[PDB]
Amino acid sequence: GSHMRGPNPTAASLEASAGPFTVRSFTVSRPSGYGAGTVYYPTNAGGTVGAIAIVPGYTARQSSIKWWGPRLASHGFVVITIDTNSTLDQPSSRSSQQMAALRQVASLNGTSSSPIYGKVDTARMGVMGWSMGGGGSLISAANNPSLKAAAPQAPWDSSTNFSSVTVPTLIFACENDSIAPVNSSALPIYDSMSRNAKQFLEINGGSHSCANSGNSNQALIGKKGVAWMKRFMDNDTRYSTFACENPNSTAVSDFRTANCSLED
């Protein structure tokens, strides 16, 4: 049940700005169930790839999360970054919209005129997002346990009980977050998940925007995002160490992981 794409990874290849694949992108013409989207895809992945939908936070737009599009897509994923129907949509709505974005990627996969016709394995999907869009990604995972992976950043949700989530979940947290403080948001959410493979990666001295476009830790955060998606969406055990390891980075102020084997 593995779906391996690309060459055997190294720390260097995963820390680099781009993976091996050429990336192209397009705006979605008639978004269905969300405000706007950009689709990033590899032109040449050598097989179908999984799809990942990424949602910004309250007031925010695609620009905040855009860096993930090329970063992931270059490693062999189809990535859709969205704007929400309103910038003031709440976590539940962001989750519906995220899923709508995945549905619409599946639609384009079956549309002969689309640049992503036949490129997507619609059975292998993941979710990411910032703040309320991170809470939305956790809600998506709770409500859709067939998702293969979740990797929210600086998550915000008025509930921290995600105990039903069985989807492999990487929580990026920002140490000095004053919007969704770690000790009331990201850590309780992480500790609530008792049934899954999971990880907690807190970025040293990070503000609430520490994993957004233009951040100073794209080597480390990009490595870990891509590794987690590869291990869990692709069942690619070449990535078990990169996904599950303490990355031994001075950029990391707190590292925790459970049910995450280093074994390949």
Numbering used by the authors: 30 to 293
Text from the published report:
Recently, a new bacterial species, Ideonella sakaiensis, which can use PET as a carbon source, was isolated.
Arg280 at the end of subsite IIc is a polar residue and shows protruding shape, which seems to hinder stable binding of PET substrate beyond the fourth moiety. IsPETaseR280A showed similar activity on BHET hydrolysis compared with IsPETaseW/T, and the result can be explained by the fact that Arg280 is located distal from the catalytic site and thus does not directly participate in substrate binding when BHET is used as a substrate. To investigate whether the replacement of Arg280 with Ala indeed changed the conformation of substrate binding site (subsite IIc) allowing longer substrate binding, we determined the structure of IsPETaseR280A at a 1.36 Å resolution. It is interesting that the replacement of Arg280, located distal from the catalytic site with a distance of 22.8 Å, with Ala enhanced the enzymatic activity. Then, the crystal structure of this variant (Arg280Ala) was solved as well, which showed that the structure was altered to better accommodate PET substrate as we hypothesized. This is an important finding as the structure-based engineering of a residue (Arg280), which is located far away from the catalytic site with a distance of ~ 23 Å could be selected for enhancing the PETase activity.
